[PDB]
Amino acid sequence: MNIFEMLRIDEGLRLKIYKDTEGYYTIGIGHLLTKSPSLAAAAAAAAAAIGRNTNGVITKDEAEKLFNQDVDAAVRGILRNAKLKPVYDSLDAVRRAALINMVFQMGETGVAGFTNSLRMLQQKRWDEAAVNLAKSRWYNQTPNRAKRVITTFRTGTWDAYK
Numbered sequence: 001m002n003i004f005e006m007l008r009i010d011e012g013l014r015l016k017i018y019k020d021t022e023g024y025y026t027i028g029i030g031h032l033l034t035k036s037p038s039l040a041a042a043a044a045a046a047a048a049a050i051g052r053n054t055n056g057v058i059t060k061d062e063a064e065k066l067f068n069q070d071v072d073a074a075v076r077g078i079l080r081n082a083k084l085k086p087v088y089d090s091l092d093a094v095r096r097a098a099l100i101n102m103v104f105q106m107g108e109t110g111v112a113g114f115t116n117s118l119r120m121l122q123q124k125r126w127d128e129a130a131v132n133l134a135k136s137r138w139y140n141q142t143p144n145r146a147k148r149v150i151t152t153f154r155t156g157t158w159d160a161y162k
């Protein structure tokens with residue numbers, strides 16, 4: 001299993017604009033287009049992202065391309081962030097995927113706000129960090145996905161995705 005496979009299970013693939021779990025316009029593999037309510041502002045963002053008039057639908061190829069860019073951006077955001085980098089540096093390969101996953105979904109700023117849990121991951125106190133991440137809006141809003149990420153951090157294995 002790897003970060004790409006992990007995120008492809010968590011996000012799914014939609015080739016037509018859709019709405020995320022919170023209502024935002026998304027397309028592809030979890031690619032947020034815009035937070036605005038306007039389908040049109042979203043169609044515009046989509047065209048800008050794809051380089052073509054898209055009339056709201058993209059190919060699998062275009063979706064994968066956006067996905068590749070977003071994972072790369074997820075990783076570079078983490079390495080550039082003063083709060084995240086040291087957490088990342090400290091983790092094994094599996095748990096690193098888990099943190100990239102969180103950054104992909106909530107952005108660097110958001111993950112950066114899990115100060116107490118980050119501190120416990122850094123200390124390798126898995127069970128406590130898992131308990132702490134569970135009292136978050138994140139956990140309460142997308143519980144199944146969050147349980148998967150949380151178990152990956154607790155255990156260090158891909159079990160939850162198998």
Ligand SMILES: [Cl-]
Binds near residue numbers: 049
């Ligand atoms: Cl983009």
Ligand SMILES: [Cl-]
Binds near residue numbers: 141142144145
């Ligand atoms: Cl969920």
